[PDB]
Short mmCIF file of C-alpha atoms and ligand atoms in Angstrom, two decimals:
data_model
loop_
_atom_site.label_atom_id
_atom_site.label_comp_id
_atom_site.label_asym_id
_atom_site.label_seq_id
_atom_site.Cartn_x
_atom_site.Cartn_y
_atom_site.Cartn_z
CA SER A 1 0.00 0.00 0.00
CA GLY A 2 1.16 3.55 -0.87
CA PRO A 3 1.71 6.51 1.52
CA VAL A 4 -1.28 8.36 3.08
CA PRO A 5 -1.79 11.82 1.39
CA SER A 6 -1.22 15.04 3.36
CA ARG A 7 -2.33 18.70 2.94
CA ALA A 8 -0.97 21.92 4.52
CA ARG A 9 -2.98 22.81 7.68
CA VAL A 10 -2.87 26.51 6.67
CA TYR A 11 -2.72 28.45 3.34
CA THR A 12 -3.69 25.17 1.56
CA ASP A 13 -5.26 26.65 -1.63
CA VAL A 14 -3.77 30.16 -1.83
CA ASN A 15 -2.06 29.23 -5.21
CA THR A 16 -5.24 27.53 -6.58
CA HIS A 17 -7.12 30.84 -6.00
CA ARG A 18 -4.43 32.85 -7.86
CA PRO A 19 -4.19 33.28 -11.67
CA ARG A 20 -1.93 30.55 -13.28
CA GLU A 21 0.81 33.18 -14.02
CA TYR A 22 1.49 33.64 -10.29
CA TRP A 23 2.87 30.09 -9.73
CA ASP A 24 3.44 28.74 -13.30
CA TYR A 25 7.07 29.93 -13.38
CA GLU A 26 7.89 27.74 -16.45
CA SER A 27 5.94 30.24 -18.59
CA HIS A 28 7.50 33.30 -16.85
CA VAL A 29 9.33 35.70 -19.23
CA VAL A 30 12.42 37.26 -17.55
CA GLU A 31 12.69 41.10 -17.57
CA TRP A 32 16.39 42.01 -18.05
CA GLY A 33 18.20 45.14 -16.85
CA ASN A 34 21.45 46.63 -18.15
CA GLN A 35 24.66 44.79 -17.11
CA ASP A 36 26.64 48.12 -17.65
CA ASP A 37 24.79 49.64 -14.62
CA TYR A 38 26.92 47.34 -12.39
CA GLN A 39 30.62 47.10 -11.63
CA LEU A 40 31.96 44.28 -9.46
CA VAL A 41 33.97 45.53 -6.44
CA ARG A 42 35.06 42.29 -4.65
CA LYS A 43 34.22 38.55 -4.36
CA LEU A 44 32.08 37.44 -1.40
CA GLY A 45 31.83 33.73 -2.08
CA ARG A 46 31.71 30.67 -4.35
CA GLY A 47 29.07 27.96 -4.38
CA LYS A 48 28.13 24.83 -6.35
CA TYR A 49 25.75 26.79 -8.66
CA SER A 50 27.01 30.43 -8.28
CA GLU A 51 29.70 32.99 -7.44
CA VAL A 52 28.74 35.99 -5.28
CA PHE A 53 30.19 39.49 -5.51
CA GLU A 54 29.78 42.93 -3.99
CA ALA A 55 29.02 45.50 -6.70
CA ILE A 56 28.34 49.16 -7.25
CA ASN A 57 25.33 50.43 -9.23
CA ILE A 58 27.06 53.27 -11.15
CA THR A 59 23.68 55.01 -11.99
CA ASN A 60 22.87 55.73 -8.26
CA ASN A 61 26.11 54.77 -6.34
CA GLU A 62 24.31 52.07 -4.34
CA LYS A 63 26.07 48.97 -2.94
CA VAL A 64 24.51 45.67 -4.21
CA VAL A 65 25.09 41.90 -4.00
CA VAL A 66 25.52 40.10 -7.37
CA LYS A 67 24.88 36.33 -7.69
CA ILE A 68 26.33 35.20 -11.07
CA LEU A 69 24.88 31.77 -11.86
CA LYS A 70 26.79 28.66 -13.05
CA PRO A 71 24.79 26.31 -15.49
CA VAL A 72 21.26 25.95 -13.97
CA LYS A 73 17.95 24.76 -15.61
CA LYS A 74 16.11 27.82 -17.05
CA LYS A 75 12.92 26.71 -15.19
CA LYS A 76 14.88 26.85 -11.85
CA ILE A 77 16.17 30.40 -12.67
CA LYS A 78 12.54 31.38 -13.59
CA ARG A 79 11.37 29.75 -10.31
CA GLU A 80 13.77 31.83 -8.12
CA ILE A 81 13.02 35.05 -10.05
CA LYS A 82 9.23 34.50 -9.95
CA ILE A 83 9.28 33.75 -6.17
CA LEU A 84 11.53 36.85 -5.50
CA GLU A 85 9.17 39.10 -7.53
CA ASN A 86 6.03 37.64 -5.83
CA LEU A 87 7.63 38.23 -2.41
CA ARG A 88 9.01 41.76 -3.15
CA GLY A 89 8.20 44.21 -0.35
CA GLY A 90 7.22 41.44 2.09
CA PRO A 91 8.54 41.75 5.69
CA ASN A 92 12.26 40.74 6.04
CA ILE A 93 12.36 39.19 2.49
CA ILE A 94 15.50 40.16 0.50
CA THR A 95 14.77 42.53 -2.41
CA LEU A 96 15.72 41.40 -5.91
CA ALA A 97 16.90 44.77 -7.40
CA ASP A 98 17.76 43.54 -10.94
CA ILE A 99 18.35 40.58 -13.29
CA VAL A 100 21.17 41.00 -15.84
CA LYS A 101 22.94 38.91 -18.49
CA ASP A 102 26.44 39.19 -19.94
CA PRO A 103 25.81 39.99 -23.72
CA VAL A 104 28.74 37.78 -24.88
CA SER A 105 28.99 34.99 -22.16
CA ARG A 106 25.11 34.73 -21.90
CA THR A 107 25.68 34.16 -18.11
CA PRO A 108 22.63 35.32 -15.93
CA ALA A 109 23.14 37.30 -12.68
CA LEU A 110 20.71 38.21 -9.89
CA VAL A 111 21.22 41.66 -8.25
CA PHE A 112 20.13 41.99 -4.62
CA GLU A 113 19.77 44.60 -1.91
CA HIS A 114 22.99 44.64 0.19
CA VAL A 115 22.85 43.69 3.90
CA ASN A 116 25.92 44.61 6.06
CA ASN A 117 26.05 41.14 7.60
CA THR A 118 27.96 40.02 10.74
CA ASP A 119 29.00 36.34 10.13
CA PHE A 120 26.88 34.01 12.39
CA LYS A 121 30.02 32.12 13.66
CA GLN A 122 30.92 35.49 15.36
CA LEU A 123 27.46 37.13 15.88
CA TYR A 124 25.47 34.24 17.53
CA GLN A 125 28.03 33.77 20.41
CA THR A 126 27.44 37.51 21.36
CA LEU A 127 23.58 37.48 21.12
CA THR A 128 21.61 37.95 24.38
CA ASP A 129 18.40 36.02 25.24
CA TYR A 130 16.39 39.10 24.02
CA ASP A 131 18.38 39.18 20.68
CA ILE A 132 17.52 35.51 19.88
CA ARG A 133 13.76 36.19 20.55
CA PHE A 134 13.90 39.45 18.53
CA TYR A 135 15.64 37.88 15.51
CA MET A 136 13.53 34.67 15.72
CA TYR A 137 10.39 36.87 15.58
CA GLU A 138 11.82 38.66 12.45
CA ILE A 139 12.47 35.31 10.57
CA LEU A 140 8.87 34.31 11.56
CA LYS A 141 7.51 37.49 9.89
CA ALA A 142 9.34 36.43 6.65
CA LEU A 143 8.07 32.82 6.94
CA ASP A 144 4.41 33.65 7.70
CA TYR A 145 4.52 36.08 4.77
CA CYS A 146 6.05 33.65 2.17
CA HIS A 147 3.76 30.78 3.38
CA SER A 148 0.69 33.10 3.12
CA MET A 149 1.91 33.78 -0.47
CA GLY A 150 1.98 29.96 -1.22
CA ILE A 151 5.79 29.57 -1.01
CA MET A 152 7.97 27.22 1.13
CA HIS A 153 11.61 28.52 1.41
CA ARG A 154 12.97 24.90 1.93
CA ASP A 155 16.51 26.12 2.86
CA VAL A 156 16.15 27.91 6.23
CA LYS A 157 19.60 27.95 7.96
CA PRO A 158 21.99 30.58 9.49
CA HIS A 159 23.76 31.17 6.12
CA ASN A 160 20.44 32.27 4.53
CA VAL A 161 19.73 34.74 7.34
CA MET A 162 21.47 38.10 6.78
CA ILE A 163 21.68 40.29 9.90
CA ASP A 164 22.81 43.95 10.12
CA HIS A 165 22.98 43.85 13.99
CA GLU A 166 23.83 47.61 14.19
CA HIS A 167 20.48 48.52 12.48
CA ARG A 168 18.62 45.39 13.90
CA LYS A 169 17.89 44.45 10.28
CA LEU A 170 17.20 40.91 9.16
CA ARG A 171 16.67 39.49 5.65
CA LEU A 172 15.80 35.94 4.67
CA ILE A 173 17.87 35.28 1.50
CA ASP A 174 18.61 32.64 -1.21
CA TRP A 175 15.24 31.65 -2.62
CA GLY A 176 16.95 29.28 -5.10
CA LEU A 177 15.48 26.17 -3.38
CA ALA A 178 12.02 27.74 -2.72
CA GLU A 179 8.86 26.20 -4.24
CA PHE A 180 5.19 26.96 -4.64
CA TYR A 181 2.91 24.81 -2.43
CA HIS A 182 0.16 22.87 -4.31
CA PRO A 183 -2.09 20.41 -2.39
CA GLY A 184 -1.32 16.84 -3.50
CA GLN A 185 2.06 17.74 -5.07
CA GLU A 186 5.01 15.37 -4.47
CA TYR A 187 8.22 17.35 -3.98
CA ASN A 188 11.91 16.44 -4.22
CA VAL A 189 13.17 15.36 -0.76
CA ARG A 190 16.85 16.07 -1.78
CA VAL A 191 16.60 19.72 -0.56
CA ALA A 192 18.15 21.67 2.43
CA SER A 193 21.51 21.15 4.14
CA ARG A 194 21.98 17.87 6.11
CA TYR A 195 21.63 19.39 9.62
CA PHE A 196 18.32 21.25 8.91
CA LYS A 197 16.48 18.47 6.95
CA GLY A 198 13.09 17.57 8.36
CA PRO A 199 12.16 13.93 9.20
CA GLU A 200 9.78 13.92 6.10
CA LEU A 201 12.88 14.48 3.87
CA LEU A 202 14.93 11.72 5.61
CA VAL A 203 12.10 9.11 5.45
CA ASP A 204 11.34 10.11 1.78
CA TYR A 205 7.81 11.47 2.40
CA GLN A 206 7.21 13.61 -0.68
CA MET A 207 3.84 15.26 0.13
CA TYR A 208 5.31 17.88 2.45
CA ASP A 209 4.50 21.61 2.85
CA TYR A 210 5.36 24.93 4.64
CA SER A 211 5.81 23.00 7.92
CA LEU A 212 9.25 21.88 6.54
CA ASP A 213 10.54 25.43 7.22
CA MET A 214 9.32 25.19 10.83
CA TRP A 215 11.52 22.10 11.53
CA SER A 216 14.54 24.06 10.09
CA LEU A 217 13.65 27.03 12.30
CA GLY A 218 13.57 24.63 15.32
CA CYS A 219 17.09 23.32 14.43
CA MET A 220 18.39 26.96 14.29
CA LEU A 221 16.70 27.83 17.63
CA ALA A 222 18.12 24.70 19.35
CA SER A 223 21.68 25.59 18.11
CA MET A 224 21.30 29.20 19.37
CA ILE A 225 19.82 28.64 22.89
CA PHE A 226 22.02 25.57 23.64
CA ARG A 227 25.15 27.03 21.91
CA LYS A 228 25.51 23.68 20.04
CA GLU A 229 26.15 23.96 16.30
CA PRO A 230 24.90 21.92 14.57
CA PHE A 231 22.20 20.66 16.99
CA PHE A 232 21.54 17.35 15.09
CA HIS A 233 25.00 16.36 13.82
CA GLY A 234 24.51 13.39 11.45
CA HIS A 235 27.39 11.74 9.51
CA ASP A 236 25.04 11.34 6.46
CA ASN A 237 21.27 11.47 5.66
CA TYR A 238 20.64 8.05 7.32
CA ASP A 239 22.63 8.97 10.51
CA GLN A 240 20.91 12.40 10.52
CA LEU A 241 17.57 10.61 11.29
CA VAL A 242 19.42 8.55 14.01
CA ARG A 243 20.68 11.84 15.67
CA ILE A 244 17.05 13.15 15.76
CA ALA A 245 15.69 9.76 17.13
CA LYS A 246 18.28 9.91 19.96
CA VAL A 247 16.59 13.16 21.12
CA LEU A 248 12.88 12.88 20.10
CA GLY A 249 12.77 9.11 20.70
CA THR A 250 12.06 6.24 18.27
CA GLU A 251 8.41 5.70 19.50
CA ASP A 252 7.04 8.96 17.99
CA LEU A 253 9.09 8.24 14.79
CA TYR A 254 7.47 4.79 14.27
CA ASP A 255 4.05 6.34 15.17
CA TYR A 256 4.75 8.97 12.43
CA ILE A 257 5.81 6.21 9.89
CA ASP A 258 2.65 4.16 10.75
CA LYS A 259 0.32 7.25 10.53
CA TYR A 260 1.42 8.11 6.96
CA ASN A 261 2.03 4.45 5.83
CA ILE A 262 5.65 5.40 4.94
CA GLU A 263 7.86 2.72 3.34
CA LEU A 264 11.05 3.04 5.45
CA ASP A 265 14.35 2.38 3.61
CA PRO A 266 15.60 -1.10 4.86
CA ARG A 267 18.98 0.53 5.80
CA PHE A 268 17.21 2.38 8.69
CA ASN A 269 15.98 -0.77 10.57
CA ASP A 270 19.46 -1.72 11.90
CA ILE A 271 20.67 1.85 12.69
CA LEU A 272 17.60 3.50 14.33
CA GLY A 273 17.56 1.14 17.31
CA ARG A 274 15.37 2.03 20.30
CA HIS A 275 15.63 5.39 22.04
CA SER A 276 13.71 7.23 24.70
CA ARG A 277 12.55 10.85 24.23
CA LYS A 278 15.07 13.06 26.06
CA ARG A 279 14.38 16.09 28.26
CA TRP A 280 15.74 19.42 26.90
CA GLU A 281 17.60 19.93 30.21
CA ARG A 282 20.40 17.49 29.20
CA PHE A 283 21.66 20.16 26.68
CA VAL A 284 21.54 22.94 29.37
CA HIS A 285 24.79 23.91 31.19
CA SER A 286 26.46 27.00 32.83
CA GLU A 287 27.54 28.64 29.53
CA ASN A 288 24.05 28.53 27.85
CA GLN A 289 21.54 28.75 30.83
CA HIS A 290 21.12 32.56 30.28
CA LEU A 291 19.55 31.81 26.81
CA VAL A 292 17.38 28.87 28.02
CA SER A 293 14.03 29.53 29.73
CA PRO A 294 10.86 27.33 30.22
CA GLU A 295 9.24 29.53 27.43
CA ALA A 296 12.16 28.80 25.01
CA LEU A 297 11.92 25.02 25.71
CA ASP A 298 8.11 24.90 25.35
CA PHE A 299 8.41 26.82 22.02
CA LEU A 300 11.27 24.56 20.78
CA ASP A 301 9.31 21.41 21.70
CA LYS A 302 6.31 22.60 19.61
CA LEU A 303 8.57 23.13 16.53
CA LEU A 304 10.54 19.85 16.58
CA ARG A 305 7.86 17.19 15.92
CA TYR A 306 8.28 14.27 13.48
CA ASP A 307 4.65 14.79 12.38
CA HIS A 308 4.77 17.89 10.18
CA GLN A 309 0.98 18.45 10.67
CA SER A 310 1.52 18.80 14.48
CA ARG A 311 4.34 21.51 14.34
CA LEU A 312 3.43 25.16 15.06
CA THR A 313 2.62 27.28 12.00
CA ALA A 314 4.67 30.53 11.63
CA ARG A 315 1.61 32.58 12.88
CA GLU A 316 1.04 30.24 15.93
CA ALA A 317 4.81 30.53 16.69
CA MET A 318 4.55 34.39 16.71
CA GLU A 319 1.76 34.07 19.31
CA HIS A 320 3.92 31.95 21.71
CA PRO A 321 4.77 33.34 25.26
CA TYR A 322 8.51 33.27 24.27
CA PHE A 323 7.78 36.46 22.13
CA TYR A 324 5.49 38.38 24.60
CA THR A 325 8.19 41.02 25.40
CA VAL A 326 9.26 41.43 21.70
CA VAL A 327 5.51 41.89 20.77
CA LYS A 328 5.13 44.44 23.66
CA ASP A 329 8.27 46.49 22.68
CA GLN A 330 7.14 46.55 18.98
CA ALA A 331 3.83 48.31 19.96
N1 75E B 1 20.84 38.13 -1.22
C1 75E B 1 21.59 38.67 -0.54
C2 75E B 1 22.58 39.29 0.29
C3 75E B 1 22.50 40.52 0.96
N2 75E B 1 23.60 40.80 1.64
N3 75E B 1 24.42 39.73 1.42
C4 75E B 1 25.68 39.56 1.93
N4 75E B 1 26.22 40.57 2.77
C5 75E B 1 27.56 40.47 3.36
C6 75E B 1 28.72 41.00 2.60
C7 75E B 1 28.23 41.72 3.80
C8 75E B 1 26.34 38.39 1.57
C9 75E B 1 25.70 37.44 0.72
C10 75E B 1 26.41 36.22 0.35
S1 75E B 1 28.02 36.09 0.96
C11 75E B 1 28.24 34.57 0.23
C12 75E B 1 27.15 34.16 -0.45
C13 75E B 1 26.08 35.10 -0.39
C14 75E B 1 24.80 34.82 -1.08
C15 75E B 1 24.15 35.82 -1.89
C16 75E B 1 22.98 35.56 -2.52
C17 75E B 1 22.34 34.28 -2.41
O1 75E B 1 21.27 33.96 -2.95
N5 75E B 1 23.00 33.36 -1.62
C18 75E B 1 24.18 33.60 -0.98
N6 75E B 1 24.46 37.64 0.24
C19 75E B 1 23.84 38.78 0.59
#
């Protein structure tokens, strides 16, 4: 027997109610700017599918970030562009400023708003309890917005969170893995970095939704309050599920597998073993106790659930007691 179908608990049919053009990115026609408006200043990074640079827009003297793409399927470039344009002006969503192509090389490049980022491997270790709640609330604004717009980011991790700590400015970036949610659609499970992959990805459950981003957000929160990066440190995708089972327990995992009639890869049987559900206190010590509170733990618990349907939505998460003071100060 095949797996049991699943539907998003919230924003289920937002794309169905939209005109086709909104989500049918394959038919999207790219609007190109002028490549001569931009001059590369310095390199910021290299990736598997791109090279990133800092640039100057010589028409207005503004600092920008330029992502020059390596060979990528045109439908995937159209997907990222279409999502970026649909999300433009949304809270804490990076702004796509321009799309340019080299006239000779035919190489496409995405031009973004620049964020004066403080690298997370330096910033996070300085963040107070209030900073973690404030920045977690800001990512949640970006997530509730993109989910309400029928989009799952699918790559939520510290590297995709740009923070200008001086101006308390956060942007959720790199929409290259993002997809439109369609009820009944089977998605590719080979998405996200190892440490942030949800149980649905690791067990090969394809009918997932926005709730995937909520697991990732839970992984980030656990690493920040416990000062343990990564929180679930698997040696591969199979061992990644073992690392989660050693914390959440194997009982709720097999209850999750049984509920959705998931065919578990035979490799898993001999590595998963039998594990009890641990108490969050075993990750608490003298150097992280100032970031850990009963509110933080309660919130974290409600994010990290094997059953995607039982995790908090981004809007429910914003309503949690953990954010009461952030909500108060913002009024
Ligand atoms: N989008 C965007 C964006 C805004 N600011 N910003 C900064 N700012 C620091 C230099 C101060 C760095 C990067 C970097 S650094 C290495 C890779 C990337 C990158 C850029 C685009 C993308 O889609 N993924 C990854 N991206 C951005």
